[PDB]
Design an enzyme around this catalytic site. Structure first.
Site, mmCIF file in Angstrom:
data_model
loop_
_atom_site.group_PDB
_atom_site.id
_atom_site.type_symbol
_atom_site.label_atom_id
_atom_site.label_comp_id
_atom_site.label_asym_id
_atom_site.label_seq_id
_atom_site.Cartn_x
_atom_site.Cartn_y
_atom_site.Cartn_z
ATOM 1 N N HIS A 99 -17.027 2.376 -19.780
ATOM 2 C CA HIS A 99 -15.820 2.830 -19.021
ATOM 3 C C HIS A 99 -14.829 1.629 -18.631
ATOM 4 O O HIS A 99 -13.612 1.814 -19.011
ATOM 5 C CB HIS A 99 -16.081 3.453 -17.897
ATOM 6 C CG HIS A 99 -15.214 4.211 -17.124
ATOM 7 N ND1 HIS A 99 -14.097 5.109 -17.542
ATOM 8 C CD2 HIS A 99 -14.415 3.674 -15.908
ATOM 9 C CE1 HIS A 99 -13.117 5.223 -16.965
ATOM 10 N NE2 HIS A 99 -13.236 4.365 -15.737
ATOM 11 N N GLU A 158 -10.216 5.172 -22.547
ATOM 12 C CA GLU A 158 -11.172 5.830 -21.147
ATOM 13 C C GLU A 158 -10.075 6.544 -20.396
ATOM 14 O O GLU A 158 -10.067 5.996 -19.189
ATOM 15 C CB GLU A 158 -11.843 4.489 -20.755
ATOM 16 C CG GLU A 158 -13.086 4.431 -21.438
ATOM 17 C CD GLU A 158 -14.052 5.481 -21.380
ATOM 18 O OE1 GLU A 158 -14.289 6.171 -20.123
ATOM 19 O OE2 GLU A 158 -14.362 6.309 -22.372
ATOM 20 N N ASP A 215 -8.142 5.230 -17.511
ATOM 21 C CA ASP A 215 -8.639 6.082 -16.509
ATOM 22 C C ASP A 215 -7.546 6.958 -15.723
ATOM 23 O O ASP A 215 -6.591 7.284 -16.769
ATOM 24 C CB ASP A 215 -9.325 5.255 -15.313
ATOM 25 C CG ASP A 215 -10.132 6.103 -14.218
ATOM 26 O OD1 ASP A 215 -11.119 6.789 -14.782
ATOM 27 O OD2 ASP A 215 -9.891 6.366 -13.120
ATOM 28 N N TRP A 216 -7.339 6.930 -14.464
ATOM 29 C CA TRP A 216 -6.104 7.780 -13.838
ATOM 30 C C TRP A 216 -4.866 7.178 -14.177
ATOM 31 O O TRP A 216 -3.867 8.104 -14.181
ATOM 32 C CB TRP A 216 -6.332 7.844 -12.273
ATOM 33 C CG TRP A 216 -7.392 9.088 -11.946
ATOM 34 C CD1 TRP A 216 -8.571 8.657 -11.566
ATOM 35 C CD2 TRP A 216 -7.027 10.517 -12.170
ATOM 36 N NE1 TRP A 216 -9.107 9.911 -11.369
ATOM 37 C CE2 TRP A 216 -8.372 11.004 -11.728
ATOM 38 C CE3 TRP A 216 -6.006 11.302 -12.561
ATOM 39 C CZ2 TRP A 216 -8.527 12.432 -11.706
ATOM 40 C CZ3 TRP A 216 -6.186 12.438 -12.352
ATOM 41 C CH2 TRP A 216 -7.306 12.951 -11.939
ATOM 42 N N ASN A 219 -9.354 4.498 -10.793
ATOM 43 C CA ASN A 219 -10.259 4.538 -9.918
ATOM 44 C C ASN A 219 -11.549 4.058 -10.349
ATOM 45 O O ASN A 219 -12.486 4.245 -11.393
ATOM 46 C CB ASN A 219 -10.616 5.908 -9.487
ATOM 47 C CG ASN A 219 -11.290 6.140 -8.117
ATOM 48 O OD1 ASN A 219 -10.757 5.662 -7.053
ATOM 49 N ND2 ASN A 219 -12.471 6.714 -8.109
#
Length: 289
Positions: free
Chosen positions: A269, A127, A103-104, A38
């Site tokens: 990130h 991350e 991430d996700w 995201n």
């Protein structure tokens, strides 16, 4: 697809429960699947994707809610998102899979693997959404904003009506400022308030200080597979990083099996934009091993 994905890259849509999952592909050989989070898409992987030509069949997807994939009127619960990912892996019927996750994309990729251990060769991540996070370890400005976003109404106003997740928060959290043209590419998927729905679900679903408890539970499902599979695993770390807190890094060293960990330099990130060369090099050496 975008030229940055390199020569001989093609795109196509993969049907799932009535919808379309847009997919960028190159080469042939063992599958290597790139899952974003995201509020990005396959475009985030482009430079790494191109530098990895010839290691196998490169597959970068846009998750449902993002990129050029469908943006339905659903609740973006983890269960619902996982279903579409599971579907995409089904359509393509893949085996000997190397996952490269961020991430996700880590949450969904690891969840898939854990239920499909026989189809997985190796997994690289960084991350990641992986574990409960302690709010004291996160940038406070993000924590405060997340807290506001979890309030009914305020979250929808900030993300969907004012579009401030994409115009303010997203470009802030880059170490190396994002080029104007690249920020516009990340924004083209999201012309309307409704198009931005999945963007808000992200921070609400993110586990901080134990909430939401459903996400703690969802993420816990892959923990047995992580701790007991012999599958080779690679975590890249970054200074200062963002989601990979020291407590979670220490957790992964203590709990995850057959895990190599390598420093990959300076980054926050969206590390694929920050250190695409280092990442691609470290992955390339890894896949060779």
């Amino acid at each position: 697809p975008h030229s940055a994905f390199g020569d001989g890259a093609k795109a196509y849509d993969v049907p799932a429960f009535g919808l379309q999952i847009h997919t960028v592909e190159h080469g042939s050989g063992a599958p290597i699947v790139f899952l974003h989070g995201n509020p990005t898409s396959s475009y985030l992987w482009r430079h790494i994707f191109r530098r990895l030509h010839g290691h196998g069949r490169l597959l970068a997807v846009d998750l449902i809610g993002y990129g050029q994939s469908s943006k339905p009127d659903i609740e973006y619960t983890l269960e619902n998102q996982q279903r579409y990912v599971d579907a995409w892996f089904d359509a393509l019927d893949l085996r000997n899979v190397t996952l490269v996750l961020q991430d996700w994309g880590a949450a969904f990729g690891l969840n898939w693997a854990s239920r499909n251990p026989d189809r997985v060769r190796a997994v690289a991540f960084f991350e990641p959404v992986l574990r409960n996070i302690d709010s004291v370890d996160l940038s406070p400005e993000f924590v405060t904003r997340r807290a506001k976003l979890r309030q009914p109404g305020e979250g929808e106003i900030f993300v969907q009506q004012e579009n401030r997740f994409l115009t303010e928060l997203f470009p802030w959290f880059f170490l190396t400022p994002l080029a104007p043209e690249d920020l516009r590419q990340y924004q083209t998927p999201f012309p309307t308030p409704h198009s931005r729905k999945a963007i808000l679900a992200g921070p609400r679903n993110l586990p901080v200080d134990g909430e939401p408890a459903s996400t703690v539970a969802f993420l816990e499902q892959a923990v047995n597979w992580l701790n007991t599979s012999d599958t080779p695993k690679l975590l890249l770390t970054f200074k200062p990083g963002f989601l990979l807190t020291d407590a979670i890094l220490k957790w992964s060293q203590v709990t995850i099996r057959n895990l190599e960990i390598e420093a990959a330099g300076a980054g926050i990130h969206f590390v694929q934009e920050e250190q695409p060369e280092t990442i691609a090099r470290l992955l390339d050496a890894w896949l060779t091993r």
